[PDB]
């Protein structure tokens, strides 16, 4: 559960992300696939080569969803309903993979925003991604 401070922290960080959300989305996926190659098994139809345009388009979609989540921190289950349907009912993604992606995203954000990525922002973003991951892996409709 996010504090008021957590939600303020998440917004402030995503505000610093700004127009680069798509790029960071792409890089987080790239790092996930490279560091944790068993994740690539959910993407057998993807071109997963280095710099693949397909990964970049998918990273943009992943970042737009998170941008959506940040505007609805008080009702993630309502905002993410359709994505839970996809990741929990259809794809049946093991939760461990959400931890791998969440970590890849913290790595990406920390590398690009060294002055904003304070320890408290890091703490808040980790809780936020865990919360998102819980929604996306839960069957609740």
């Amino acid at each position: 559960v996010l504090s008021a401070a957590d939600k303020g922290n998440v917004k402030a960080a995503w505000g610093k992300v700004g127009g680069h959300a798509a790029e960071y989305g792409a890089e987080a996926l790239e790092r996930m696939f490279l560091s944790f190659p068993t994740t690539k098994t959910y993407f057998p139809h993807f071109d997963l080569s280095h710099g693949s345009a397909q990964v970049k388009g998918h990273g943009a979609k992943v970042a737009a969803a998170l941008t959506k989540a940040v505007e609805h921190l008080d009702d993630l289950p309502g905002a993410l309903s359709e994505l839970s349907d996809l990741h929990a009912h259809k794809l049946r993604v093991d939760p461990v993979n959400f931890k791998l992606l969440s970590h890849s995203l913290l790595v990406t954000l920390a590398s690009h925003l060294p002055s904003d990525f304070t320890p408290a922002v890091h703490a808040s973003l980790d809780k936020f991604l865990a919360n998102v991951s819980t929604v996306l892996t839960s069957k609740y409709r």
């Binding site: 790092r31 944790f36 913290l106 790595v107 920390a110 060294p114 320890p119």
Partner: protein, 145 residues
């Protein structure tokens, strides 16, 4: 562990690392991001705020010893199990730290490296370091599993 080209890239990156700064930082963020970890360091003084934790002199000094321990690991990548056997028993039998926490600190260290090096901590480099920290985590978990 790693191919010879991998150990080479990893060793050469590691020579760039300021162990004082990075170890203080990593231990600090462990206690801030995963706040229950503070239980194991309760004699360290005030850990009630993020600034308190990161300014805490004992946290800095211990984070530096953690990284020296890791630096030692970096020299024995084919024998992490033996290298970390004594610490494995210490964290299990004396400190009762759940081994899940070993992976958390390993990940926090990767995040700290990225924060401190930006572009230079490339995805290929980070992937090799993921293999290292997972190997250290497993070596430290050996006296349970």
């Amino acid at each position: 562990m790693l191919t010879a080209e991998e150990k080479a890239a990893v060793t050469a990156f590691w020579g760039k690392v300021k162990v004082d700064e990075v170890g203080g930082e990593a231990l600090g963020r462990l206690l801030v991001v995963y706040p229950w970890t503070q239980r194991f360091f309760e004699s360290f003084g005030d850990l009630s705020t993020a600034d308190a934790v990161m300014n805490n002199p004992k946290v800095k000094a211990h984070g530096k010893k953690v990284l020296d321990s890791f630096s030692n690991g970096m020299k024995h990548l084919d024998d992490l199990k033996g290298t970390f056997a004594a610490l494995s028993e210490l964290h299990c039998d004396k400190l009762h730290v759940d081994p899940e926490n070993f992976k958390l600190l390993g990940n926090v260290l990767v995040v700290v490296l990225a924060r401190n090096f930006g572009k230079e901590f490339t995805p290929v480099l980070q992937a090799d370091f993921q293999k290292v920290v997972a190997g250290v985590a497993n070596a430290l978990a050996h006296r349970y599993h």
